[PDB]
Symmetry: D3
Subunit: 275 residues, 6 copies
């Protein structure tokens, strides 16, 4: 059973992954790093799920890493010389990066719905998601320099590739200052702001349901190629897209869409097969 998160079926095709340690403001304890990997690897193979919503139980999205677990992991490493310590740490860092890379490698769209603070590992988490919504009281903080380290589980790799303003990204990173909702929306880190958590969740789940109404081949192939396209040249990415759609265009999802158009039936009334 997951002890640090809770996964529920919100509605057809939609999975809700909720950070669930509210008494610690969803701090990321050691086991969370394994649990979120297990969770998203399962979601990736689940043929019924078409979209994911991520939120936090309690008063805020996440306070970030569990500082005592961090201290045990990093300040008490095994190894009888510095090279052997580094060998251990490289494996540790690589394993913790996987906690948020599984979100990006999940072909289903993942929607983060943030309320209150989203601190430290929270920003690494949400920058690996596809769509980000927040509440008016939310705030974001690349807290790691205040802990004595450069963020290593995805923020520096992905945050600069989800918004345009690099001066702001650098200021947030080097100072660890909070960015409140108004500025988060202005920056584009979030694409919508809601007055409270209930209204935001309603909108997040309505978005996930709308995505789930569409062909899953088209939606999940879109995510896959948006991610490929971020990291490769336009020409390399067009070449990959032709190699991708030479099989994916051979789908009944297009046949059904064309049949609907000919019959003058809205596309939301089509049923697509599992993926």
């Amino acid at each position: 059973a997951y002890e640090s998160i809770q996964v529920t079926s919100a509605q057809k095709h939609v999975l809700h992954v909720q950070l669930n340690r509210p008494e610690k403001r969803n701090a990321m304890n050691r086991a969370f790093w394994r649990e979120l990997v297990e969770c998203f690897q399962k979601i990736s193979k689940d043929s019924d799920c078409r979209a994911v919503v991520v939120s936090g139980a309690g008063k805020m999205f996440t306070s970030g890493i569990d500082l005592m677990d961090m201290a045990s992991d990093i300040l008490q490493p095994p190894g009888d010389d510095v090279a052997r310590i580094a060998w251990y740490l490289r494996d540790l860092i690589s394993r913790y990066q996987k906690t948020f890379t599984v979100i990006e490698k999940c072909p289903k769209p993942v929607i983060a719905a943030i309320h209150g603070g989203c601190i430290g590992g929270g920003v690494d988490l949400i920058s690996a998601c596809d769509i980000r919504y927040c509440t008016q009281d939310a705030f974001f903080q690349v807290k790691e320099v205040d802990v004595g380290l450069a963020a290593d589980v995805g923020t520096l790799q992905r945050l600069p590739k989800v918004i345009g303003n690099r001066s702001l990204v650098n200021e947030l990173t080097f100072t660890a200052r909070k960015m409140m909702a108004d500025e988060a929306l202005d920056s584009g880190l979030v694409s919508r702001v809601f007055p409270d958590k209930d209204v935001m969740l309603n909108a997040a789940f309505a978005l996930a349901a709308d995505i789930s109404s569409k062909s899953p081949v088209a939606v999940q192939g879109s995510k896959i190629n948006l991610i490929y396209s971020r990291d490769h040249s336009v020409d390399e990415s067009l070449d990959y897209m032709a190699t991708w759609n030479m099989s994916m265009l051979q789908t009944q999802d297009i046949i059904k869409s064309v049949q609907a158009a000919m019959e003058k039936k809205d596309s939301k009334s089509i049923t697509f097969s599992k993926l």
Copy 2:
């Protein structure tokens, strides 16, 4: 004598490429994919053209792909097994991507001037242009998921590389929702919004004239290197730029400009040779 587009000389150095099937809302049919390649390949070799404006005839920029021409192209493919159908489809996708890659590979700046809807293939087109202007009634839609396929002619590869907000790009792509002019300006997809098509085209042709008054070596070398720099690291791009300008700095265009500066002569009075 094109079937789907019309190319005219607007004014000195400026070509106007107009999508021209107004009775069919400029739907992109079979000939369109071949003709835009022919058109921009000729523009690229045209030593008198320094800038291009692209617009649509009739009520809207484009309704996108012609669905029954698409059904013919994709739903009745030749091939006696899936691998052979995929062979055919890979070639088709590759050819149709070239329709918009030729805009990027044309060294002259290309300005898209959108009025009304710009749907599906329309967003693949405008995201391959350099500068985008639109009217107050314009709207943009990454419609492909509603037809059962991930966009494959450029939107996924270029759209996220022309605006900063990746949460918004992902929402647009997975939902196929319309983005209206105000939001398109806010996102930076378009540079300027105008009240109506006439005012927009006046400003687009004024922008094209202004660009055409500049050294063509400087302007077209700037487009070539901005594109190279998007796809390569800064250090690789600086190395390429040094190899580029070791030839291109050997021009009378600079000597003329330094001489004008020395005499206190406006740089707008200088005439530059063809390119």
Copy 3:
């Protein structure tokens, strides 16, 4: 020491690099291209410096390149044939690019504080800095096309990688038009605008002091990995980050920062060792 710049110790750990030819509007003459390289190479090895502020003396940040020196270097080149001229120009361009590349390769965060005009070479300089602030009267101009050349000392390689709106980047580059402070803030080129130079400098120095109060290992490792991550895929950048932090997490800065957090003390109360 220097002919074209002046370097002062503003406050603990902060260096102020001031363009210092106010009677010539801080034009970038031959000495400037050599001196900035010497300066930032020394700052990169200075174990007491943790942050840098760059500003200009007099009326404006910079009028840009000295055209007379440029013509001597570029319109009067050694070389008895075009290939031999190009061999010399390749090296010249490479050396002038280094003037601004040393700002990016300097591990300390560099804050540009712009007042009045920032023209041509000034945009190449500020787009190699990390954080950009300006005054209400500032303006920015990618002036190179008006001189007859595509900008080659950094703007084309870095400006599109510091802001999201590529339509604006292309319009600024191809027309060489001025972008004023309100639009610079809107575009994200600058992340803060101030009423005057004094207020701006007070905030830039306060920002530099805040940054300098943090672990230098964490801040400088953050800059190094933000730059690496811009130019590589997310997966390559995560791999690099694990190989980086397998040594950099082995620091007393974590114990010190965590202890301070436990006692509710600020970063400024901690003494981190030199770097």
Copy 4:
């Protein structure tokens, strides 16, 4: 009705492309650069061809570029300044590189069968082919430095990627010395050496027939992925291969081969559909 080459059907599925200006030792003149592009573009779309053999008519494979056609192309270029001459030359070089890039971009295996000298442009040609055979009297020469230029139509990009010994490649390139058949076999530039042209062409057409007896999906997908794998990391190349074979494994070519294996039927008796 080519002026510089001749294309014939050797036998089922095999095309023979012969350099055909024997009175001028198959010198590569102006029409040759255009015609080899036309020829291989047609071969690439020819669903009956599965393999190609390239040879030269007359006394030798090729003497290389036609020097007085080269003088015309390069020494009398249009352009009223150096930058404009370079614009013209970049386009020329790019077009002439396509003459040999089309061989690599053709998915059918291309076998070069060299007798006598293979000089300058000859090495750019054969290094773009997949398999190389030669006669005992054959010789290879990277002659370009003796004409005053670094080879630009493929040798420098491909030759070091078809043999292992980089010291030898560098010596050949900087000295322009001839490499004879024995050394060409030892270096691995050629796979097999034959006593005379007739024996070599028999073996080249036997090799082409053998390749043509195999599944064309398997053979041409193997060439496409060997080329992709040369230019990308192993992990990027494995990812591309999975995206390629998720379509291409859906073929009757495998079902037929497993069925033959089940019955104990030679795999040489199977017939495969066109591609």
Copy 5:
């Protein structure tokens, strides 16, 4: 433990991974693809192992993939349309690639000791190992085209990156012909040939023991950086190497190795800590 392989501790620090279905000529059935991944993932974390030897039990190294299992997995796929079939096959191919990729990602050197036939999947396996030895009766065959598919589990991505002669690589791939031991040695595919399996194994184990007598930090860091350097530019690889050795040079293995050199003692006389 395993159904298709057997793992034994040969001698101190050396593990022997033996393909172990001798009655079936070590055919690679469904279990094998899972088991090799489990095996090398465990060896990668085994702090006592420093080198691995891979061999096959019975008459031959391996006959390659089990065709019946392959047909079940590949000619009988789940999926109600071609796109959904491809979605499943992409994952299948990706998982089978991991079977051999874990050998490359294992930081310990892996020595392949081949006797008799090494067919199809066997070449994919040995081209992911580091050092290859064979017997006089061994032979190698890139058999996949004879099954109707382009090899997808590593040969095309790694074989051309382990030997220099690309004409030979292409001939072997397109014809599926056998390459015997003398030619395998000549090509560099194997670096040593032995008269029989016993003599070969004695030398492979002696090599593994020699390797294991060296600092494991130095040897495993050497493999990691040889692999990184294959896939990146020399400049990127040098940068990575400096970021790697800034931790790995901080080891007692240097003091120990240098002290032994000063006393004229061999590596085997030193005790290096586990890794």
Copy 6:
């Protein structure tokens, strides 16, 4: 004055760089790492030099690093915590890599002429050279694992990219065993073997003179593009080659070569201008 090397003018256009600490078998002391950088940076800018020969004074090419200097550099590093030690070591490693990278970044061809042992840093040196010749008594040794470290100054980055046999490269690296001349020639690491040092040097200088007789624009542009081509795809490298030769074909070196051919004068009688 260089204390660890000696540079002489061997003959017109040829520079001889000789390792010159023969009483220590040319061991690489601390200052050598700076001296070779100063030396090749000067040679790179020297317009009279067209080729370089590198050899060692005394009984052998080089015994490799000075072990006591290594111990002082690496085993006595400054820094009050492991991260600050790593900061120092990264800068040290980067600086020592430059010692051999300057050889590759020198546009003139560099010929290594090895006699006796070429140990440790000797292999990093010669693998950065372009052409390698040796004597019958020579031997090569990737000695670093015997010292407790993975080679970091170029061998792992370049050795695998100068020869084809990766199994041999891995065996040499992991065991640190010697490779004698016969095997070095067979591998292709050297391209010629001579009976003794005098005969080898005569041949090295005759090769350097032959290279120096050719156009320096063609020779040095060839080196530059061979190196670019090793590290980039063929398509990227052809694009760079067109951008390179759009200026370099505009040389009198080609005019003179064509005039010689028309006059029936051998090309070795042409005089080319300095570069």
